Amino acid sequence: VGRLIYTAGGYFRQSLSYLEAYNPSNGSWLRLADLQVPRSGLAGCVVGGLLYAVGGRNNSPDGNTDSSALDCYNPMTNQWSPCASMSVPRNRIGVGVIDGHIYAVGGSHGCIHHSSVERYEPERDEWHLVAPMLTRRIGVGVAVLNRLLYAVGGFDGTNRLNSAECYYPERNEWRMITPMNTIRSGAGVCVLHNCIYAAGGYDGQDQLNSVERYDVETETWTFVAPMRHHRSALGITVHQGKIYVLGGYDGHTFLDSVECYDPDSDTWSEVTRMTSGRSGVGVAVTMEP
Numbered sequence: 323v324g325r326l327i328y329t330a331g332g333y334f335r336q337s338l339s340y341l342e343a344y345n346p347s348n349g350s351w352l353r354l355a356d357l358q359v360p361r362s363g364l365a366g367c368v369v370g371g372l373l374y375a376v377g378g379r380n381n382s383p384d385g386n387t388d389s390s391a392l393d394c395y396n397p398m399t400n401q402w403s404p405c406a407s408m409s410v411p412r413n414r415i416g417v418g419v420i421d422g423h424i425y426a427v428g429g430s431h432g433c434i435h436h437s438s439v440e441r442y443e444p445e446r447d448e449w450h451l452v453a454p455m456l457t458r459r460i461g462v463g464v465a466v467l468n469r470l471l472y473a474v475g476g477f478d479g480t481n482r483l484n485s486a487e488c489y490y491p492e493r494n495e496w497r498m499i500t501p502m503n504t505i506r507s508g509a510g511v512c513v514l515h516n517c518i519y520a521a522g523g524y525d526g527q528d529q530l531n532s533v534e535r536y537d538v539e540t541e542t543w544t545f546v547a548p549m550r551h552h553r554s555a556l557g558i559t560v561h562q563g564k565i566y567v568l569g570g571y572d573g574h575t576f577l578d579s580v581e582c583y584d585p586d587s588d589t590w591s592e593v594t595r596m597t598s599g600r601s602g603v604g605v606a607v608t609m610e611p
């Protein structure tokens with residue numbers, strides 16, 4: 323009990339500093355301490371009850387600064403603190419956690435599209451590079467299942483991608499997996515039960531409402547019910563056996579919609595609205611502040 327869905331940063335006209343937390347048990351939203359630096363295209367994650375904001379970019383009227391930052395938010399104090407910075411700026415990043423360690427995957431620095439990957443050790447407050455992906459990927463979806471790290475879709479600088487790959491930590495090695503049925507850049511990627519879900523994204527022509535899942539045992543991708551809204555650059559997380567998607571861009575509006583997927587009924591429902599429409603957020607779940 324007592325866990326909230328935290329959304330950090332995002333974009334609407336410029337990069338945002340908002341930290342806001344949604345309580346699925348009562349429908350309430352709380353506005354919490356702003357990020358020290360506004361950022362869109364970041365990712366969020368939680369280790370040891372602390373919320374981490376990783377990478378992104380501050381797009382403002384006066385600048386476009388890609389972020390190498392790792393910042394940690396403690397719900398017990400409602401305060402952000404800087405942590406060690408990554409080796410390189412990573413906008414449009416994906417992140418995953420294995421065994422208490424944060425993996426930062428891909429992303430962009432100016433016109434550079436990274437294949438590099440690095441791993442953070444909270445105990446030592448240190449990052450170290452690991453093996454790079456087989457593909458350069460920005461707008462890459464990342465998730466962890468069974469202590470394996472997956473990088474899904476994205477954009478390599480020339481093409482949006484349906485390909486996906488998996489990192490095996492004990493071998494420090496990446497291998498391709500079955501590609502998705504749909505090209506997806508800027509999708510929401512998460513894990514639920516024994517599958518990696520890829521929701522939404524941009525296929526090079528349109529923002530998508532379709533959703534597909536990779537069963538790690540059978541190595542197949544299967545479509546599930548589509549979202550109500552087409553969305554790219556959405557936030558995503560899992561809480562109490564359901565997927566939550568937050569915001570994004572539908573080709574017309576920066577959405578405030580939050581939809582929730584129930585795998586037992588294979589249905590999506592609209593559960594709340596953010597306080598304002600935005601894309602490019604980082605999202606994670608931890609205790610209320």
Ligand SMILES: CCCCc1ccc(S(=O)(=O)N(CC(=O)O)c2cccc(-n3ncc(C(=O)O)c3C3CC3)c2)cc1
Pocket residue numbers: 332333362363379413414460461476477482507508509523524526554555571601602603
């Ligand atoms: C263009 C204007 C359309 C409306 C719009 C949408 C979103 C934002 S964002 O600030 O959230 N952002 C903007 C940024 O960093 O370029 C952002 C963050 C994460 C992923 C992505 N993403 N997803 C799909 C694709 C794609 O093209 O394949 C991309 C781009 C190539 C990286 C974008 C701002 C404005």
